Design a protein around this nucleic acid. Structure first.
Ligand SMILES: Nc1ccn([C@H]2CC[C@@H](COP(=O)(O)OP(=O)(O)OP(=O)(O)O)O2)c(=O)n1
Ligand SMILES: [Mg+2]
Ligand SMILES: [Mg+2]
Length: 539
DNA sequence: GACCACGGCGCC
DNA sequence: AGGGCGCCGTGGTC
């Protein structure tokens, strides 16, 4: 079936390529091929051959299209079997597996990659026949979103490198005072970054009670959660918690980011993986910029490093209580839909409760703390953890949970139907019909089954919120382009854009609107917008 | 070097 | 008897 034709391929051919590395913005185009009909074209000079393509269709299209943009070519990504398969089963996340599961082997030869894309797409397209909903999501959301993600990856984000460079030396000194004291307290040095070594010290040398064990190995845990419980037992516990904060921030953001600045751009270029999560959410790789610090003071100092190009502004937009809103529409609960119809904020109300202060006294970080209480309790958190979290009597934690769901009656009924259907159907789905398979919903082991159940009914909520953000990006991108503004990052229910100073407001105004009206629900979708020279200030 | 499991933890 | 991610060291491989 496979013949070999001279490079020049016919329009609509399936691309096949090989990079020196995973990152499109950093990689070297080692090989470029194409497959169409029954023939296969191997470009003798890849980079140069890229100028020939009208579009990138095939496994990981967006990736070669990011390279193209990096090279000055506006090569947009088109059909990509990974998206088709990802939609059929979100557990389809790598070419390797999609190929073994659908008709081929993922190799290192571009030509074979081009052939495989063609045949893989044929199979998978057949599979989508009759799946009007998956076809809708593919054609109306994913395929076009892939293009958006490529421009985003190619564009990147500006970072105050000199700023992080000095920040390092500074905390490096604070980490020394903390480890120097932790060692004194223990009465001798040891690797503080070694959970095993600290375990021995905390539980064997000192006489601290072991409050928990680790999952796969069963070792006594030394988690922040355990350390919190032990904070009052020994002076060495607080010192260790602070050390862990600093070292985590410094080793994960403070030190690595400046070293990832691209030479040709001077900006940071993260990957936005389109087929990596079970719920339909994107993910950020290599630099993972979807988890930049924001909670603690040093975390905030780190976020400030993310800045706009001079004369530009960072416009940050974030849907409000997004998953509580999605849930009011999915559940159809009147109490909850009214909550939003009345402009109430459950994070503020829960935070007002937690800290026992009027609503107007709740500050940003206090409200943020409530988020983990609201989403945790919604998604199955237990009274024990709740109490052990809010540091309240187990009984008072039970009451908060009891009342939480009593206040929103239709939610449990919805969670119930979602699970039932998941058991029968074999999968759960989002508002737009994105599916996630949860076979374990019928496991005999209560442990496994109940855990499956929790991931099961979370998917529709989490996934619908993602479908929504993805639609908004697809809708918003063309207008920003028309406005000379750029889309830099997506943080699940937040978008970080960059717009010319003289246009920053019109852009914030527009994006906010596109986002809020993406797909009308039983509840309004509110978006808080912020503008500033840096990410922290934007929010 | 490269890469793995595991614990641990940053954000959503 | 919260869900979804990816990255960083520590140990231990190859
Ligand atoms: N602990 C968390 C935090 C967030 N999320 C999910 C649900 C909300 C979504 C986006 O997170 P945020 O923007 O931090 O939350 P939000 O509830 O939309 O609230 P707001 O933007 O009003 O602070 O991610 C979650 O499952 N668990
Ligand atoms: Mg939000
Ligand atoms: Mg957010």
């Amino acid at each position: 079936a496979l013949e070999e034709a001279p490079w020049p391929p016919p329009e609509g051919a399936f691309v096949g390529f090989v990079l020196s590395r995973k990152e499109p913005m950093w990689a070297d185009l080692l090989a470029l091929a194409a497959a169409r009909g029954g023939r296969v074209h191997r470009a003798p000079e890849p980079y140069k051959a890229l100028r020939d393509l009208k579009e990138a269709r095939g496994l990981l299209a967006k990736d070669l299209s990011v390279l193209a943009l990096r090279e000055g070519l506006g090569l947009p990504p088109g059909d990509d079997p990974m998206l088709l398969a990802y939609l059929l089963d979100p557990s389809n996340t790598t070419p390797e597996g999609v190929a073994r599961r659908y008709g081929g082997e993922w190799t290192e030869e571009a030509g074979e990659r081009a052939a495989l894309s063609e045949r893989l797409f044929a199979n998978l397209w057949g599979r989508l026949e009759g799946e009007e909903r998956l076809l809708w999501l593919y054609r109306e959301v994913e395929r076009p979103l892939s293009a958006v993600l490529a421009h985003m990856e190619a564009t990147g984000v500006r970072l105050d490198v000199a700023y992080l460079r000095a920040l390092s030396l500074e905390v490096a000194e604070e980490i020394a005072r903390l480890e120097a004291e932790v060692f004194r307290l223990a009465g001798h040095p040891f690797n503080l970054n070694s959970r095993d070594q600290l375990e021995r010290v905390l539980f064997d040398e000192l006489g601290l009670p072991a409050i928990g064990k680790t999952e796969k190995t069963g070792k006594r845990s030394t988690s922040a959660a355990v350390l919190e419980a032990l904070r009052e037992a020994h002076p060495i516990v607080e010192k260790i918690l602070q050390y862990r904060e600093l070292t985590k921030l410094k080793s994960t953001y403070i030190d690595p980011l400046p070293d990832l600045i691209h030479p040709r751009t001077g900006r940071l270029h993260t990957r936005f993986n389109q087929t990596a999560t079970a719920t339909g959410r994107l993910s950020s790789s290599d630099p993972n910029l979807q988890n930049i610090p924001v909670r603690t003071p040093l975390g905030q100092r780190i976020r400030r490093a993310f800045i706009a190009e001079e004369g530009w502004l960072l416009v940050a937009l974030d849907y409000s209580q997004i998953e509580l809103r999605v849930l009011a529409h999915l559940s159809g609960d009147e109490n909850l839909i009214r909550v939003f119809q009345e402009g109430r904020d459950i994070h503020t109300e829960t935070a007002s409760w937690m800290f026992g202060v009027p609503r107007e006294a709740v500050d940003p970080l206090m409200r943020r703390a409530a988020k983990t209480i609201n989403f945790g309790v919604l998604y199955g958190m237990s009274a024990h953890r709740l109490s052990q979290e809010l540091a309240i009597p187990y009984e008072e934690a039970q009451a908060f949970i009891e009342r939480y769901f009593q206040s929103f009656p239709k939610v449990r009924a919805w969670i119930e139907k979602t699970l039932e259907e998941g058991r029968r159907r074999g999968y759960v789905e989002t508002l737009f019909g994105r599916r996630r398979y949860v076979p374990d919903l019928e496991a005999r082991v209560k442990s496994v089954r109940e855990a499956a159940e929790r991931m099961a009914f979370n998917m529709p909520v989490q996934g619908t919120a993602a479908d929504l953000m993805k639609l908004a990006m697809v809708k918003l991108f063309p207008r920003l382009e028309e406005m000379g503004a750029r889309m830099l990052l997506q943080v699940h229910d937040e978008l970080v854009l960059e717009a010319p100073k003289e246009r920053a407001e019109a852009v914030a105004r527009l994006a906010k609107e596109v986002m809020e009206g993406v797909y009308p629900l039983a509840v309004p979708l509110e978006v808080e917008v912020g503008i500033g020279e840096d990410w922290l200030s934007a929010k």
